[PDB]
Every structure is written in C-alpha cells, then in structure tokens.
Amino acid sequence: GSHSMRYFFTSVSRPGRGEPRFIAVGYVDDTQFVRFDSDAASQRMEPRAPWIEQEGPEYWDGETRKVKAHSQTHRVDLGTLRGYYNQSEAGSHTVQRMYGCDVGSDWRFLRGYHQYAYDGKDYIALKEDLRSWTAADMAAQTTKHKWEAAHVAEQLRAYLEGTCVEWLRRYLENGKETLQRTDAPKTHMTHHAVSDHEATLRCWALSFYPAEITLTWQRDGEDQTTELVETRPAGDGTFQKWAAVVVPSGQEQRYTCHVQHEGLPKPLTLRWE
C-alpha cells in the first residue's frame, strides 16, 4: 500500500518564563520513530522505534544538528510573528510546522507537503506543485514574498521529491517487520439497554494497524447517522475504535455494522446474534 513520512514541530512561547518549548517528532505512517524535546535531558534527537536505533552516530549527530537549527528558526519566528501581528508580550503563542512525503505502492513519490501554522490556523503552505505558496492573510503575504525571493520552494521541493522519499524507503526496509505489516481489527459488538424501549449497540474494532479504518452502521442496508469516537492508540502500536447506534428494543436485527480496514481480506459485517 502507500506510505508516508512526516515531521511535526511545535514551538510555544512562554512569556516571562524564558525560552520557548520546542518539540519535534517523526513518523513513518502511524509509527513514531524519533523525537526531540527542548525540555528533555539529552538535547539530542532520540530514537523511538527499534529499527531506527541501528542508525550510526553520523545519523544522530546530523539529525541533532538539524533539529536544533529548526528550533533556532522557530525561536526567531515567534518574535517575528508577534511583530507581524503586533501582539503583546503577555500571551503565549504557538507555531506549528509539518512536512513530509507520500509514496505509492511502488514506493515512488506521490506527493510532498510543507505547512506552517500560527496559533492553530494555517499561516502559509507550499502548494501541491511544490513551486508556489498559499498565504493565509496579509501578514503571511510578507513571509510569502520573503520565501519567494529566497527560493525556499525549490529547496523544499528538492528535499521532498528526493531525500524525503529516499529515506522513507530506507526506513520501510529497515523496519519492514513493523512498518510493512497490517494487523486486522479484532471485532465484536456489545448490547446495552438505555431504557425499557431502547438499546445501544456498539461495534468495536481493536488491535488494528494502520490507524485508518471505517466503521459504519446500516439499518436494513442503509447508512445510519450514530456515535463514533476518534480512533485512539492502545499504546502497543495498534489502535482502537468503536461506533454505536441507539435502536428500538426488538429491532436489533435491522442493524449491521460494517468494518473496512486494509488488513481485512474483505469488509466485515457484524450483527447482534
């Protein structure tokens, strides 16, 4: 199937409390593999997956040098943005950056991205052609002009179409056992009365990987709208999710739960029986 590599960076100012917090994490698909936290003891990029531990000191020194550079850039950005928006020094603000690449089943480049947000909203993003920018507002237009003048896009494009993909392939190979796997969901249903006339049917999907999954409820073959929780991590590398519907007692058989997941030969149909 397809695969992705993504780096997420969060920088948060701490008014009157010194230096901003900086956290960076790297993921291949839904598996985290590296982290850096300005408040941690090492002050180095650290491994978070067994397959990345085999990388040598040159890798770790290089990653640590680059993540620190990222940190430094974001530290400056916080001040610049507070300036662009003429915000006071009293409040904490947040900068977030995400970049990475996707490859198809043949492991060839599919798409790249580099998005930046300020206080939880889009600020500036590279367009899918990787040659132009989308600026959120007037202030971001200033950064857009600056990055166009400096040819930032061609630099990110070279990284996103080359380096990013090359390393994603390397990681997929080195961590083949855990990254190129699919764990089909273990499914079941529960039934609990809500009252003397109604019951909640809950369709459960557990221990699955990757995280992408679709749980749908149908009543006599027709989609229903039902409660769904956000897919959540089990903590062991797999995920969990459930979907529920309230039905009139006695009509349970009119309902079916459908589960779709790349680890499933064909979609599952569950019924309370």
Binding site: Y7, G62, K66, H70, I124, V152, Q155
Partner: peptide, 10 residues
C-alpha cells in the same frame, strides 16, 4: 531524515 535546506525564518 530531517530537511537540511528550505527551513528559513518567516
């Protein structure tokens, strides 16, 4: 691996 180019201040 992290980008070594294209990361510039806003």
């Amino acid at each position: 691996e992290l980008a070594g180019i294209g990361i510039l201040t806003v």
